[PDB]
Amino acid sequence: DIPSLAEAFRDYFPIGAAIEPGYTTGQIAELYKKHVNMLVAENAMKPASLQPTEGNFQWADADRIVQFAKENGMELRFHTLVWHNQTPDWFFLDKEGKPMVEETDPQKREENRKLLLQRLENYIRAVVLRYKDDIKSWDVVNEVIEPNDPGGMRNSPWYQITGTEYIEVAFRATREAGGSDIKLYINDYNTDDPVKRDILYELVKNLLEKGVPIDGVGHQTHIDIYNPPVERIIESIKKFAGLGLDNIITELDMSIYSWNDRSDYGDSIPDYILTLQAKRYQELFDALKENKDIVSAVVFWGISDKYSWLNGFPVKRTNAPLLFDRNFMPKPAFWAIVDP
């Protein structure tokens, strides 16, 4: 009989995990029931899943995850209302079916700006009205920052057509349809990086000054056994806390390969690698525990190494980013944080 992961952090913060509808039954489901008290949909609540084509919403998968959470008293997070990825291309086509970004006529572009914002409003209202009562934490916009793009704003179709308007409207629309009780977040990765951190900080500060309802920042925290320094992760969290914003570790996982490594340990995986992973995780959680009053939740991007995007991205290989192995057994990293 091993200890429950979430129970170990009873006095600090809830522990969550991303999930797919198919993992709501069977042994994998029992693993979730024993170790986490919060859930987020890995893919079932992205735009591509909820409204594949205009006016044709698909709720089954998302509803299933909501029901599983409620049956087990788990809190829910919504991932994610706005994102340049996994969003059907129909969103950005003009009335003739051609990409809005290609329009050169000023008047048609103005028409397209209003049309896209109308689509955004209607999409958000439908989704929020359906889940506002069961989901209290929302990733309203995701990955809108890109240092390499002009001004540091990701130059996605959303931005090319509406500038920062889509972000302002997204938060406002979510607040109006959802009420004052739900918490709204802007989520992103590499939020520990000084440059990206400050760009995000300036944007949020400006938006807050304009009255945009933003409650906190989501730090995906997709890191690895080598980088980045735990100090940088905490520095970012404290900086945003200075604006009165909450912080959530939203998609925590730890690749066993560095950024420039394309090798594959295969079945194996050296002992020191799993031990190093444990040391990194222990160091991270020791720091997160010291910041519990500004970090409302810590969510892992999964629960078992059997199911992780890192096993296929950037390449197909054997990764081991989580706390439980492919047989759902506790890894060194699990013991390192529940009994360090």
UniProtKB/Swiss-Prot annotation:
Organism of derivation: Thermoclostridium stercorarium
Similarity-based family: Belongs to the glycosyl hydrolase 10 (cellulase F) family.
Protein encoded by which gene: xynB
Origin: domain of life: Bacteria
InterPro entries from the UniProt entry: GH10, GH10_AS, GH10_dom, Glycoside_hydrolase_SF
Residue ranges constituting the GH10 domain according to the UniProt record: 1-340
GO biological process, one term: xylan catabolic process
Active-site residue numbers: E143, E251
Pathway: Glycan degradation; xylan degradation
Pfam families registered for this protein in UniProt: Glyco_hydro_10
Protein's UniProt name: Thermostable celloxylanase
Enzyme class: hydrolase
pH dependence: Optimum pH is 7.0.
Catalytic temperature dependence: Optimum temperature is 80 degrees Celsius.
Swiss-Prot/TrEMBL catalytic activity: Endohydrolysis of (1->4)-beta-D-glucosidic linkages in cellulose, lichenin and cereal beta-D-glucans; Endohydrolysis of (1->4)-beta-D-xylosidic linkages in xylans
Task of the protein: Active toward xylan, carboxymethylcellulose, P-nitrophenyl-beta-D-xylopyranoside and P-nitrophenyl-beta-D-cellobioside.
EC nos: 3.2.1.4, 3.2.1.8
Keywords: Carbohydrate metabolism, Cellulose degradation, Glycosidase, Hydrolase, Polysaccharide degradation, Xylan degradation
A Gene Ontology molecular function term of the record: cellulase activity
